[PDB]
Amino acid sequence: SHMINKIFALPVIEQLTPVLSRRQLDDLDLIVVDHPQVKASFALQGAHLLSWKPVGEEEVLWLSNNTPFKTGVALRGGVPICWPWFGPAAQQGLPSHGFARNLPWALKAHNEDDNGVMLTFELQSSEATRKYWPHDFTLLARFKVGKTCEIELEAHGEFATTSALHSYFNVGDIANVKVSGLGDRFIDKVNDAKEGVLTDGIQTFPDRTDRVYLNPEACSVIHDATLNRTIDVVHHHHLNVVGWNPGPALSVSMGDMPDDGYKTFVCVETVYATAPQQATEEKPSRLAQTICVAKR
């Protein structure tokens, strides 16, 4: 979290409200929440929740001290919004995880309390956007940050998507981490998409792990023995959960993560991937994740 600190140290370009401001790190406008109950930060690019620290806690979200902050380049960490496909594209030459995380959204709305801050971000289809995904849409992302954190994605239009909230959670040492509540069946993307079965819903992360759980509980729990805390992750409207850590070899290969980056995070993702999600004029597709922390 040197990188998160670098963020809260930036000068203010606009004081939106006594608690919300807009700042800039290289190429990217950020929206920064400095509030008595919470510090959180966002990039307009990809409405990307970059950090989240409820008062009295260690940073809950992990952010790479290597991620570029460049126009149209995906941020490494935080909660990448993966939309309108999850994972590698159908067509060679299109990126993994959609294009929403690549484009500027508009901060459409915000209110605050003594408890926290709500923000609504918006992203609209364009004649630009359509050359590679030929569909009109309006995508909304809503956040309530305070002592808990709520993230809500809503897509309007008439189409199928596959998507994820690709959350990176800050963890003391991936070696003392287990994540419970994962259920039984999973698909192991690291191993030829084979199916396996947990007998107790607990995944550990000895090395590279990339798992799509078919039957997780609503709430996944990160147990962290270094920082001495659990992190609750509650999934809504989703089909799957995914647990991922690159491991050392990939953490090195990746230009946008430090060699030892994988030591300090686990992704527990809220996903809709093993079947298509349909939005319609009347019924927009939705995905949501709620996060809590508790020491000990």
Coordinates of N, CA and C in Angstrom, one line a residue, residues 15 18 62 227 295:
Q15 N -12.5 20.3 -5.0 CA -13.2 19.8 -3.8 C -14.7 19.7 -4.1
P18 N -17.0 18.3 1.2 CA -15.9 18.4 2.2 C -15.2 17.1 2.2
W62 N -6.3 -4.5 -2.2 CA -4.9 -4.5 -2.6 C -4.8 -3.7 -3.9
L227 N -2.5 -10.8 9.3 CA -3.1 -9.5 9.8 C -4.1 -9.8 10.8
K295 N -11.5 -7.6 12.9 CA -10.2 -8.1 13.4 C -10.4 -9.4 14.2

